[PDB]
């Protein structure tokens, strides 16, 4: 049961990595569920946002390491609270939308991985 | 269930030096030195690399492996007490009669005297254990600070000063008068 839900997560992640060349790693701190929900709706058409336990994710990437070897570079960046954005749009347009939306007294993009290349941005 | 090997670690900072013959611990640091007899607890010590010391017990019962973590906490308290020091802040609490606290000297022994606690004519004197320094703090009303190296000596002196001001033959939920410890910390806290 728990394992079954977990197995599904592993599979979807693999599919997402294959589906979108552009990957954005986003760090969320003090972001409300409502704040997150709005961002998801704005980016529903061009982006996929994935949230998961890091321990779960690292194992998955290692499991899928033989295929898509360049994704290994993303693993150091995975540490800390993180989210994964998979998008057709290459870079800035997605980034601009994420930072701007729902800033209240705050989503940040920690790193960008595109086509096997990592950008601090 | 006779745990055949359980083992804890203590970290030794750069400033201190710890000397352990049989079960007598001497910790020497910047603020001074402290010692401790531990011949009642039956553990074994082992220096690893001059900043780590493991303490272990072999074939121990449940009470014995409880005592292992206890003695680790005691020697670690000694190390952090000789590095950062220990400071207990206590506050004076009264309704009508103000508590008047001074420091007197019968035969040069540094007594703390307490006057007018709930208006009585009796004068409460608590002695001061050695190594504990007492300062009546400014800029906060009615606050006393006890500082030292030994957490045992500082907290015991603070507890003696708290217990000397107990109210008799009254409802103590209404007669809340006394001297109560409000803060426990280090002399160089947030170092």
């Amino acid at each position: 049961g728990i394992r079954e839900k977990k197995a599904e997560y592993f599979a979807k992640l693999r599919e997402y990595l294959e589906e979108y060349k552009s990957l954005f790693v986003v760090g969320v701190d003090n972001v409300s569920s409502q704040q997150m929900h709005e961002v998801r709706k704005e980016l529903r058409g061009r982006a996929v946002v994935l949230m998961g336990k890091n321990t779960m994710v690292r194992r998955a990437i290692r499991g899928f390491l033989s295929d898509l070897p360049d994704f290994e570079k993303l693993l150091p960046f995975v540490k800390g609270n993180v989210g994964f954005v998979f998008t057709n749009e290459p870079l800035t347009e997605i980034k601009n939308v994420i930072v701007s939306n729902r800033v209240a007294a705050g989503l940040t993009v920690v790193q960008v991985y595109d086509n096997g290349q990592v950008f601090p941005s | 269930m006779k745990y055949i090997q359980t083992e804890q670690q203590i970290e030794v900072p750069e400033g201190v030096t710890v000397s352990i013959k049989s079960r007598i611990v001497k910790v020497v640091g910047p603020r001074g030195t402290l010692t401790k007899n531990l011949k009642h607890i039956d553990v074994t010590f082992t220096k690893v690399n001059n900043q780590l010391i493991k303490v272990a017990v072999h074939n121990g019962g449940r009470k014995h492996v409880a005592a292992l973590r206890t003695v680790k906490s005691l020697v670690d308290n000694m190390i952090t007490g000789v590095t950062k020091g220990y400071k207990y802040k206590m506050r004076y609490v009264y309704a009508h009669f103000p508590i008047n606290v001074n420091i007197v000297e019968k035969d040069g022994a540094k007594f703390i005297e307490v006057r007018n606690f709930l208006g009585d004519k009796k004068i409460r004197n608590v002695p001061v254990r050695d190594g504990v320094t007492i300062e009546f703090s400014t800029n906060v009303k009615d606050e006393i600070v006890l500082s030292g190296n030994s957490v045992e000596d500082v907290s015991q002196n603070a507890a003696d000063l708290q217990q000397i001001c107990r109210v008799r033959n009254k409802d103590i939920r209404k007669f809340l008068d006394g001297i109560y410890v409000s803060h426990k910390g280090f002399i160089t806290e947030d170092l």
Binding site: - | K2, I4, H58, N59
Partner: protein
């Protein structure tokens, strides 16, 4: 006592209505043949409608340990009668042979639950062929990599009533 394991095979006495009964077999830990056959008939009277007057024993054979110098982990399933009821227990013992394992089992039950030989029923004993199927911590403790431990506080018993120096408990 010091236990031995026997197979005991018996059957009912053959009648004209039914010759060749079904030859039941059981494994008994006992001190000797007499106690082994008594325990065999005890458990067959608990299982089937037979008794010693109505049946016979066709074979009794001692089964000694196949590898008496291999260190095994055994899982043992046991019934015992307490002072208020009957309970099932599973205990696992790291030991070198089956008879010694059930000897330490009988000592363990008599020590920890005050259960006697008349109260303990041995359901089964089986070697656990794989590690990480071991479920008790007191035996899983001894399965770690490079297990080593000291023996503190050596006490040497003396032959003389007087010793001429203060003894040492270094080991």
């Amino acid at each position: 006592a010091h236990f031995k394991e026997y197979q005991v095979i018996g059957r009912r006495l053959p009648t004209e209505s039914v010759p060749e009964p079904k030859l039941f077999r059981m494994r008994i830990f006992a001190s000797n043949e007499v106690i082994a056959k008594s325990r065999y008939w005890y458990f067959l009277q608990k299982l089937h409608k037979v008794k010693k007057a109505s049946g016979e024993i066709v074979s009794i054979n001692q089964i000694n340990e196949a590898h008496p110098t291999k260190v095994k982990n055994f899982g043992v399933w046991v019934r015992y009668d307490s002072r208020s009821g009957t309970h099932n227990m599973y205990k696992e013992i790291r030991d070198v042979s089956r008879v010694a394992a059930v000897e330490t089992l009988y000592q363990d039950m008599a020590a920890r639950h005050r259960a006697r030989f008349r109260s303990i029923h041995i359901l089964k004993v089986a070697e656990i062929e794989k590690t990480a199927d071991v479920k008790r911590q007191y035996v899983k403790q001894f399965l770690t990599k490079d297990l080593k431990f000291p023996l503190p506080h050596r006490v040497q018993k003396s032959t003389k009533t007087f010793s001429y120096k203060r003894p040492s408990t270094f080991y």
